[model samples]
Target: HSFSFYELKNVTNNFDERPISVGGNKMGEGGFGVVYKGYVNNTTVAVKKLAALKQQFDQEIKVMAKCQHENLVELLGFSLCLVYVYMPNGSLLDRLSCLDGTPPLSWHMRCKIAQGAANGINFLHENHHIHRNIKSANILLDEAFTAKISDFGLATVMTSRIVGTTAYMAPEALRGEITPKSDIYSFGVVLLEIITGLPAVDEHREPQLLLDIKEEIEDEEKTIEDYIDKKMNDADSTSVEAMYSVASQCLHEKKNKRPDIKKVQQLLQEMT
Candidate 1:
């Protein structure tokens, strides 16, 4: 609350156009505005700038102020100018794709990211706010690969906007309905993506009735090795099993059957 609008402009150098950083293309546009990579005072920060006339601007600011946790992305400062924060390494989507080069993500980093993200999601649900969007691309990583849930409720700014990416959207959100459980469903898709290293929307496949990935995950014949990224081949069995368990619980077809975020967090924490 102490951060003023004028100060934000000073920090961002008036939103300079020097191409400071570029994030993954997976960042879907939202009502508030598009999330982007930029530098503020020479420090890299992820910027979520709202449209001048965005309807949900007030609601988003209020919600952000009320919800803050270590695992959740921190809100460094905000104003009519732009909202800014310390940019972690990048999005999980970018990290996953980085495996082909450099040192592939270690088994430990993957588990840590999943556990941290689960805790952040749990915190949101506990506060009674719906994230409405949860996907690898939105889960950012710090230098240590610790996860932070970003872009929570950005879609709300677009009054007519039905929030979500086709691949990571929960079934209910896709159908124009949103509940806390909807975030759980979206998180489930994210878990599947982490385990499988596959994009949610497979261009090679036909459209499906459900945005859910239950069937793809439940094929009994498929083992963790079959679904998990090959880079995770060195991951401990306990960690892999823990991920699959919580992920499965989150994706339960019946909303009522889905595990609460608290439970998911505990299971993931124990594994990590």
Candidate 2:
């Protein structure tokens, strides 16, 4: 249900002042207009200014409200903009590349994050929802670093517009074809990022990270261990191998050959 603008104003202090922790370097922008932190009834919240029309916003609201999972960001309320529970740790991207002098995440923590995100995506697929965008930036983390898939149920709103990051998008999606497998393809790219601690597109490099990893895998001399993040010194080889295998399956060129999200979830759970 939508809230009245007056009610929204009351909660957001008329959207006048910028949130203390959400602006400056911590802020991120995307399909949604400038996202800002706000207070509602003394509770911290994230306010996403919609860059879409009323019709588009209304269409997304119904589906977004229906989605509820521990691994999914809660759509708290909406008016002129959407409101969500504030994620203190920000995004998976932020956590993966922490710049605050904090120790890097451990291998076990990364595995937990991957499993949670996979479960969240599986829930969406089972409900016949397609998360057109699945990138590290869209995977939010709480104070505890629990991964929660965010920006879901917005594909319908972005039907005519390109929604996902190009490097993470499936080849089919880039060709104007979208399917559940497209999301899986993006998931594969994310897995590669998790393993390599590299962006989908490496700096000034022609080879995409996924393609590079695929080539590395195809080489008989190179092992999955060769592609893992060097920062993760004590990672379990067995778990890393299993995750790479799953990522390879998810990135198959043929959509039919790709494993379903449920299977992906199962594989990730087993690794955990």
Candidate 3:
């Protein structure tokens, strides 16, 4: 459905105040823009004031409205800005960072999150769409911790520009040649983040998790245990190894060698 600017303004209280920002429950920012929690018809909603890419707004609305899945964030309505269903728990980046005294997520929970995100990406690919930007920050979570892929402002009907987070972008994407495999590469980085509880890139602007674990991922003799999150004491080694194998395949240097999103989703489902 569509909405008018006045209607959005009324729902958002003229874009003056937001409960989430005031109550310290505001979701994080994205490449497109900052997000705020607002209310429309007494129901909570996420309002995104997109950056100056007027050309992409219609495309984003069309793509999001066409694609609906349990694991994909739902598009509510839009005027000059877009609105979506509010995710109470916030982005995967916030959860992975373990900020605000929140306890670290369990291995099984992470597995579920991974599977849900994979399912979302798989759905996008099945529909002949490409989520150019697929990073942990864009993966939102609900009250029950269900993963929902978000931020399709940069998504295209097919491969397009190199508009995504550098750390999670594939080598080909860096050269302005995005494809479905580019999303797989980004998802692989997210999997590493989930497994190791580390940022995709470190403060020094270097690939920490991917680079550090490359040898282990490639060497059969090397174990992934050392690279796993230390907070995870009850992690099942077999499950961890399986996910690692899947992640390794996703991060393959050659795009042709990377497993498709469907394969990745199936692997994650089996693990769960």
Candidate 4:
């Protein structure tokens, strides 16, 4: 609560939104606000500008402050801005795409990422919360590739003029019923992405949706191994199919059919 307006400006060079290298210090976009990177207390921090979503920011600030887990992006401090510990590895999707000239995450790390995110999301459910915005973009990773969940933009939809991000949303969410199962459905989409190194949705693909790829497997028209990401260079028969089953079950069209977040976590954690 101590950080005031000028203090944030001092940290982020006046909240530069320029670019990666030219005239910018902006970190990335979130469903809730513009994020910019800065150095505070000699530690890298991400500052989420609350000008765009003030009330929801206030809610997230209060609730997230009470939550703590290894896979959670810690809310460092806030004033006019919501500060968070910067996750250096960046968004999970960019890593999956290898879009930043960085090496791809190994198969082992992808499964670890799966388990870590489940742990974080499960914690939120236990505390009577739903992320509402769960996707690759919301999944931040540190230097060690540990996953951290962030961006609780839809925590209070009464203040949300926004709707859920469709690609990751549960079918039931479309009817205005948001629950932990909604989050679980999204997690299934993420699990599918982790095992296959594919995106939830795509602009230039035949099916144009990764979940549809799951449909192909469900029909036995294609195989999981046929779709598994070749970049991992070591993903094999057993592990891929095991997760394939878990992902499909969570994506059940009926919300009652989806696994509880804890069960999902247990299944993923029990895997090698």
- Each candidate: RMSD to true structure? 4.3, 3.1, 2.9, 2.2
State which candidate has the highest TM-score.
4
Candidate 3 vs candidate 4, TM-score winner: 4
Q: How high a TM-score does candidate 2 get?
A: 0.88
- Which candidate order results from sorting by lDDT in descending order? 4, 3, 2, 1
Which lDDT tens digits does candidate 1 get at residues 87-199? 45767877777743645677777777888888888788888888877888788887777788887665221225576776666555666676777678778777777766666
lDDT of 4 by residue, 1-272 (tens): 45777888878999988875575897777646788888887788888887555667668877886778999998878886788889998889889989868898888889889989999998898888878778888899998999998787765232223368888888778667757888888888888888878889889986887777867888999988888888877676787787888899888998888899888987887677
| For model 2, the run of ten residues with the poorest summed lDDT | 19-28
In model 2, residue pairs whose N, Cα or C atoms come closer than 3 Å (at least 3 residues apart or on different chains), thus clashing, are none
Model 4 per-residue lDDT at 10? 79
Q: What residue pairs clash in candidate 3, if any at all? A: none
Which of the predicted structures, 2 or 4, would earn the higher TM-score when compared with the native? 4
Cα lDDT computed for each candidate against the true fold: 0.67, 0.77, 0.81, 0.82
Q: How many backbone clashes does candidate 1 have?
A: 1
Candidate 2: misplaced stretches above 4 Å?
A: 1-26, 156-163
Q: Per-residue lDDT tens digits of candidate 2, residues 124-164?
A: 88888888899988999988888998876455122455557
Candidate 4: clashing pairs of residues = none
Task: Please rank every candidate by TM-score, starting with the best.
Answer: 4, 3, 2, 1
lDDT of 1 at 148: 82
TM-score of each: 0.81, 0.88, 0.89, 0.94
Please give the lDDT score at residue 226 for candidate 2.
71
